Structures are given as C-alpha cells and as structure tokens.
Amino acid sequence: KTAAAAAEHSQRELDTVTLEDIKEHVKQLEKAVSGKEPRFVLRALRMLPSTSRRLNHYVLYKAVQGFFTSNNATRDFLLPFLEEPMDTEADLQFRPRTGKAASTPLLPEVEAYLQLLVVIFMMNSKRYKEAQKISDDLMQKISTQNRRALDLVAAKCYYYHARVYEFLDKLDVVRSFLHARLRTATLRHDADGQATLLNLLLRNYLHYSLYDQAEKLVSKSVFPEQANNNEWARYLYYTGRIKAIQLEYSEARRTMTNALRKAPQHTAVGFKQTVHKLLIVVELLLGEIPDRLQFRQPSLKRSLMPYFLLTQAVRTGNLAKFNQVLDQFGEKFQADGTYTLIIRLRHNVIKTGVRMISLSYSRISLADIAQKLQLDSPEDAEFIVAKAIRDGVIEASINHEKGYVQSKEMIDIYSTREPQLAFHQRISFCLDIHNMSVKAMRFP
Amino acid sequence: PKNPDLRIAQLRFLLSLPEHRGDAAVRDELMAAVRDNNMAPYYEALCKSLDWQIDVDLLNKMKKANEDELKRLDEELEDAEKNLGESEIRDAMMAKAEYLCRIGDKEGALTAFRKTYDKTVALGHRLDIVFYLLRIGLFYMDNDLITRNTEKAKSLIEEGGDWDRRNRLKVYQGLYCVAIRDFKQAAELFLDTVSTFTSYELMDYKTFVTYTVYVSMIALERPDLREKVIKGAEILEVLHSLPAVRQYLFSLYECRYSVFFQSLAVVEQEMKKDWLFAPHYRYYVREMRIHAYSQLLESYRSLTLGYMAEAFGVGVEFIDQELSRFIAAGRLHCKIDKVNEIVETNRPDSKNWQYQETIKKGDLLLNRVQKLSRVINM
Amino acid sequence: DKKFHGILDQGEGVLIIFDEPPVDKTYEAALETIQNMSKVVDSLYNKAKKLT
C-alpha cells in the first residue's frame, strides 16, 4: 500500500525535523544557562505546544539513548521502568555528543524537556499510569536540585501533570503536591512556577466548588504582576467567577471584561466562550444590557444562542418567557456553570427595569412608576425605589410628600474636579510603560 | 428588461412573504412566467404558490427544443470552424448561456458563465459578463456571490473602464442598500444620479430617485443635505412627478411634522412590499423617527409635552411612551419630567464632548500600548 | 440652521441669547494627535508581528 509508505515517509520527516528542533532548544538552554538569560527558555515554552506530537515511542527511546550518553541516574532508573521494546534489528547510531560533549552530563533542563515531550506524546496516548509515574520522577529530579532555570520548563511540566491527573479525578490527591510546591516556589520567588501553581490550585477548588477555600487562597495569596499574559487571563477568569458567585458584581464584571479583552483574539474558542458567558450573566445580573455585537460572532454563536434568548427575555421583562426559557435550557445552563446566578436573575429582573426608568426619566410620579414596573401599589414602588437608591444603582432621592422622584442635579463632578483624577491614572500608566521600556533595553 | 427581470424578482417576493398581497399580482406573475418558458424558476414558484397546473410539460417541451437548437447550432459552428479565442463559436455558446440564465436555474447559469469566461479576450466583453453575473446574483439574492463578483469586477478589471463604472456605481448601491449599510456607501454611491443609462436593474428612473431620496434622508437628516438633495437639480426635476416623496422630504426639511409623520407612515407601508423591506421595515422607520425628534428637540431646552404633541398633532401619552423608550435606548439626549410634563435638553457642550471623546480614544490607545509592551520583553 | 446662537425655553416662553465658547482648539489638536499615534501604534504592531 503506497499510503502506508507515504505515511512512514511523513513520520520520518517529522521525526527528523523534531530532532533538529530539539537540538535547537537544547542549544537555547545551554545559552540561557551560560548567560543567565531565560528569554530562550520562555521562547521554548511559547513554542512548546507546536512540538506536542511529532514522534513515536521507538523514536523517543532511540533519541534518549543517543542523547543521555552520560551515565545519568535519571535515565538509568527510568530505562528499566520503561517497557522493553521488542527486538528490532533497525537501530540507528545517533551520537551527536562526542568527546567533551558526550563526557559532559546532559543538563537537567534538557532531561526535563525530553521527559515532558514524552509526557505530551503518551498524553495524547492517554497513558495515565506512566504519565503519573514520570511526573513523580520529574518531581524528585526537580526537588533534588534548586536551580531556577529548571522551573521555567518545570512549570509547564506541572501543568501537564495536573492535566493528566484531572482525567483521573485525582485533584484531591494532587492538592497536597500543589500546595507544597506552591509553598516552595513562594519561598524561592519563582515567578512562572508560582503563576502556574496558583492557577491550578485555584482550578481545583473551582471544579470542586470549595469557594470559601478559593476565596481564602485568592485573598491571602499574592500574585506577582510580571506574570505571563495567559496566566494573567486565567487568574482573572477564575477570580471573576469566584466574585460573581460571591454576590459581589461590580468588581467581578470589571475584572471579567478586562480578562476577556486580555484573552487571545482568535485562539481558545471554548474558553473565550465560557468567559463571555459568565460575563454575560454577570452583566445581566447587574442591570446592564450586554453588547449585542458578541451574540452574532461566528466563533461564539451556538454556545450562547440560549444566552441570547435569555437576555432578550430579561430585557422584555416577560415572566412567562423567562420561565419557558429556563424550562427549555436548564440542562445547558447547569452544564455551563451559571445556574445559581440565573436563579438570582429570576427575581432580580426588576432591578434592570428600575435602572432603565431612573436613567431615562428625571422626575416620575410614584403611581406612574408603579404602573411602569407592574407592581400594583404606590407603597411597593416606594420600597423598590428606596432599594434602588440603597444598592447604589440609581442616584435619585425619593420625596414621599409630592410623589416626586428627584434625579441628580446639573453639571456633576465630571466637569469640575473629575477630569484631573481621570488623567492621573492615564499618566501614571503611560510613565510606567515608558520606564519599563527603557529599563528593558538590552543585556549587551 | 435585460437579464432575468428584477421586476420578476419583486413579484416573486410579493407572491412570497407578503401574506396579504397575493390577490392579483399572483395572476400577473403567473401569466408573465408562463410566457418565455422559465421552467426552472417556475418549479419553485409553483411549489411556494398554488399547487400546480398542467402546463409545465407544455412549456418545457419547447424550452428544451430551443435549448437543443442553440446547442446544436453553436456546437456545429465550433466543430466546423476551429476558430478559438473570440470566435463566433464563443459568441454563440455565450448566447446559449444567456438563454440558460434567462429561463433555467442558477447553478446551470453560473456554470455556463464560468465556462464562457475563460475564452474572454475583450475587457469590455468580460466586464459585461461580470455585470450579467452580478445581475443574476442580485436576482437570486446570494450575498456571497454578489460580494465576490462585485469586488472582482471593481478591483481586477476596472482599469480601462469606458465610464461603465456608472453602472458599477448603481450595482454597488443596490448591494449596499440590500445590506443595511444605508449611510456611507449608500449615500455617496448616489452621487451619480445623472444616469443616462436607464439601467435594467433600475426598476425605473422614478424608483431610482425615490430610493436616492429615502437613503439620503436616512443617512443625512438635515446635516447640510439641502445642498445635495433639497436643491438637487435633477432630484427636484424628477420629484415633481412624485408627490408623495416630495411631501415626505419637504416635510422633514421645512419642519412640518404633522405631515412628516403621515409621510413616514406611508413610506413604511410602501417599503413593506419592496425588495428592500427586510433591512428597513422597522430599522429605517425607527431611525427616521429618532432623527425627527432630535431635530425638533434641538433649538430648544425645555418643551412642554403639549407643544411636542401638537406639533406631532396629538397623542401626548404616545409621545411620553416613545420618548421614554428612545431615551433609554442610548440616544436622543433629553430627560423627561413627568410631574410637570416638561422635557429638558441636557446636551453636552463642546468641552464636555471633547473630553469624553479624548478619554475613550486614550483608553483604546493605552490598552494597545500595554498589549504591545507585554508582547515585547518576552 | 445656525443663523444665530441661542436657545428657546418653551417652559417660560423665553428666548435666550448668548455666544458659543470659541476657545476649544486644544482638544481638537489633541484628538488629531491621538489618531496619528493610533496609526503609528498599528505600524509598530505590524513591525513586531512581522518580526518577533
């Protein structure tokens, strides 16, 4: 079959390209170790997903035999544990390391890189037992040494280990290692390791709904600002979800919009869908109409269509429509992770209406407002308007003597003393950008 | 006239969606389709319309007869004469494609036109082919094909245009009116209202000018439009025979609102049963209502709702309801005061609007700067 | 039609006469500068994306 020969040729080409690339990342690691410049290791992490799957088990075994020519204890211990391949006559002699290069032991950076590559390979293989064992061995190998350069790849190593363990539903088991390793990173101040470790520690509670624990771990912990964009986006998403479930809404919405903007524009379709969905529910709960622009995006269309229906129903303020939409889409809502806040909406609907009325009018007779918001009582209207003022959604003082509902006054602080405070934040941020730019000029 | 009739297209829509307008236009459309043997479209036309009648055979017999005649003629010419390129053989089979478009379906016509394009060696004879293809695409309302064809014709080939672009302007405008993009392209692309070619796609010069005036009003309520439409030479000249359109435009301009509202009602009714009713039926009406209220509100600071209602005739309660909804929408700066039935015009002043624009522009630029800075310094 | 500067308050049946504050060029120049910097930011974005 010519198809089999073509596939074998393609696999051989991919393996050769991958060996060349692995040599390139090894050279990058050597340069970063020599010059204390982890920029190359950041590049390797950035391009790490691209090299997820281009080899085979036998190719990996031959590569490891050729590379770890040094009498490395890690390879010595790992080889017997690896399943012994069947006797094969075809064994290419791959000896890139000769003389000084061969004598020099292979760096733990390279060892971890190759190990995590095997992790990705047998991960797509879904080889959970060996994944876990290899992760544990990697954990011991990292713990033996205390070099910062290792953590650069070790962070994604932990990430992949956690992802493997999630399938096994062993989060309650991982938590111990996660907490301990976070403590160690904190005692060493490893920025990226800390970022990923905090992220996964939060993710555990999020899936297990230990929200009080999550609040503890978010408030008491400290997130360094120099973290990566992706980890920042994850942190913002999880924090936004926690706050939104926590009945605090303004900060949650602000943070969620900031994260969504920070999130990749074209990648992470599902994750972007989830973040948009949580932000949509939060906004609707906070009595603000969302942006209709999103609900037409092709990238996030069908995962939201139920939410488009929900937002239209809430705006129209039709109880029958809201009940029917819930009755039709409760299962999807549960699946998404928004049932609690939607149950909150199911009685908080009238807040959006009070906000819209108090924003469109400037003085409404209380009987008129009662007729507007279908309450059937001036007393009920008075209570509701007092509630609107209390919650801080409207800024009108109710005068229960002439049915007045007096809105705000004439020109506000936003033309008297507000613009200066507004400009101060902008100027601080711009100067900060400039200072970071100048201080990040160059090494040589 | 030329090309499958956009008039037939409008009749199709009528016997279509309009659920009360199926009385006599149905008869006209049926008896006009029966002539000329458009079996392909007639299939779906009968599927949507009344069950059937025993005429499909009595038409398609001779339809296939003429198809076979043309095919035999052009094929015999091609076989006899080995002439290639711009040969009478190509003329003939392009004529066959013309008949195929005129009577048969969309897929066959498109295949025929694609086949005949490859032989084109005349830029004009290819521009006209693209015009035909876009006409068919508009007839069948295929947005993707329309956009691809329009962009191709405009860009790849529009270099030696012997002032055929006027036609391309009109087709661009038809497209951008089908799309709800009524303002920028729809307004500017009616600068060529001096159209010597009473185009086929144009139902008539009267309909062209009516569309021009409607789109002009929607895109420019009174933003110094008078220099283009109110004083428009040819615009007025044609307008003199369109009393309804003259009433509507001059009512919005001269500030005679009691009649502007009736004009808008009639315009909405008329646009309902039109091939551009999907993107306007309520959007255009709402925008025009908003612009009328905004124009009246300007020049004033406090207006008693009695006065506003009277200017609009009467309907004080309706004025409150509409004003409330529109202000809530996020436009039409004003704040109602129910307890006294007075409105207030809280328009931001020059400095306020300038600063509220600078703050947001700066917000966008700073976010961009931060993202770039993060991208660098990996 | 901007024949003259003023405003009408139907509430009191009173016509108000005044002038429009002219000194505003600062913000217009600033907004133009902001747009120019937006174009330059797009350009630098392009340079960075083309070359890492």
Binding site: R426, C430, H434, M441, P444 | L372, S373, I376 | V40
Partner: peptide
Amino acid sequence: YLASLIRSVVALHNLINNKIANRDAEKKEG
C-alpha cells in the same frame, strides 16, 4: 495625556529597534 503618549510610543519604538538589532547581531555572530 499627550506628553505621556508621545514618550511612551517613542520609548516603545526605541526598545523595538534596539532589541531587533541586538538579536539579529547575536544570532548572526554564531
């Protein structure tokens, strides 16, 4: 706003060019 924006953009461009030049030089050295 104006001064901070101008200086920020200028500094970003200067860093961009300096890093590009030094990276190309180091890559080409060996």
